[PDB]
Amino acid sequence: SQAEVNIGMVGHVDHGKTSLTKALTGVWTDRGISIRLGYADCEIRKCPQCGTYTTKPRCPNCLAETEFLRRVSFVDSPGHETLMATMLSGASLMDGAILVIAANEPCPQPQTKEHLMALEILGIDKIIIVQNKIDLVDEKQAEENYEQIKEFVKGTIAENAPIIPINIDVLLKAIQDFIPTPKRDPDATPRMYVARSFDINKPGTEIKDLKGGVLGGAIIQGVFKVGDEIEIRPGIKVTEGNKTFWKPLTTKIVSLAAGNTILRKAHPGGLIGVGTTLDPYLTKSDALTGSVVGLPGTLPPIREKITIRANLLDRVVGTKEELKIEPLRTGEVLMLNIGTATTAGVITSARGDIADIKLKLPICAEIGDRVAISRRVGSRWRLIGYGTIEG
Ligand SMILES: [Zn+2]
């Protein structure tokens, strides 16, 4: 069994989502605002006897063989800006989320407010709220923090989310109750985002012992089967004759895996290791990150220019003036994230909330796809908005 759902771990970087990720998965969560997906799988098990919920093969409170229920995957990003961009670009394919809020600090913390805004923009309503560090602080601090949380979420998409003061048993239960696997169409056209790519060969391996490059796929919809012939949109730049266009990569799925679990099929949920026929040099060090995979001839069109509808984000994280709200202008150079792809671009025409943008790098996307927008707000790139492709 692979992961059936993607769950975002959000909230201020110091409120506790990082340790919480480790406890449920045994995984240590770890020049432009790139898309860098962080995945962490958690197998929810239960004990027939005591009914305790756990990730352990044998019971925590009765050493009995637990039973498998469902596998889930948590999604995180290196930092705040990156996580926000990863959600607004559609790269994260969230079905639900866990918003971690510390009790020892005011509540609304900027980052915390901003993450909720991304959840709302994304229409993600399967939320579980965790009031961490209740151990610290006293009975008035808590209860005051609790009311701040209820206030902060009032009027938002998380107004009815369970508030859980934090134990592994209670959280796993809640994940199962409040974030159920969504209904998906088994026959939807197979499409996939390449979030990572690698060369799994160690130094000095013999040529006849070399293995096809491996892809780190985030399946958007449909089912991919081992043996499927696939096509890799944007491909690579080639110079034949007097041209230099972008040529698609065609290869075959040699294997599929959910972490270390072997699969024959693979659908949306978690990061899927896709073994291919591609020579290792084409995949090494995420060379192909931001690409789109699908069955031959079924991939969305390649765009070198685009028209988007953009919304300015009402940010609270940042200094002053840096917090200003500035509309897109003609001639501006932006940094865009669409899918798991990242590319610079310049505005050839700003007409209100609409802009024609010429990209430095080709993109494979459908009309209606999401876009994360950033601008050099000083000595670094800063996320200023989000939108969709309408042309
Ligand atoms: Zn038990």
Curated annotation (Swiss-Prot):
Residues 76-79 are annotated as: G3. One of its GO terms (biological process) is formation of translation preinitiation complex. Its EC number is 3.6.5.3. Its cofactor is Mg(2+). Mg(2+) 2 binds at residues 14, 32. Gene3D superfamilies: P-loop containing nucleotide triphosphate hydrolases, Translation factors. The keyword NAD does not apply. Zn(2+) binds at residues 47, 50, 59, 62. Residues 32-36 are annotated as: G2. Mg(2+) 1 binds at residues 18, 34. Residues 11-18 are annotated as: G1. Residues 2-183 form the tr-type G domain. The keyword GTP-binding applies. It comes from the Archaea. Residues 132-135 are annotated as: G4. It catalyses: GTP + H2O = GDP + phosphate + H(+). GTP binds at residues 14-19, 132-135. Keywords: GTP-binding, Hydrolase, Initiation factor, Magnesium, Metal-binding, Nucleotide-binding, Protein biosynthesis, Zinc. It is an enzyme of class 3 (hydrolase). GO terms for molecular function: GTP binding; GTPase activity; metal ion binding; translation elongation factor activity; translation initiation factor activity; tRNA binding. HAMAP family: eIF_2_gamma. Heterotrimer composed of an alpha, a beta and a gamma chain. Belongs to the TRAFAC class translation factor GTPase superfamily. Classic translation factor GTPase family. EIF2G subfamily. eIF-2 functions in the early steps of protein synthesis by forming a ternary complex with GTP and initiator tRNA. This is Translation initiation factor 2 subunit gamma. The gene is eif2g.
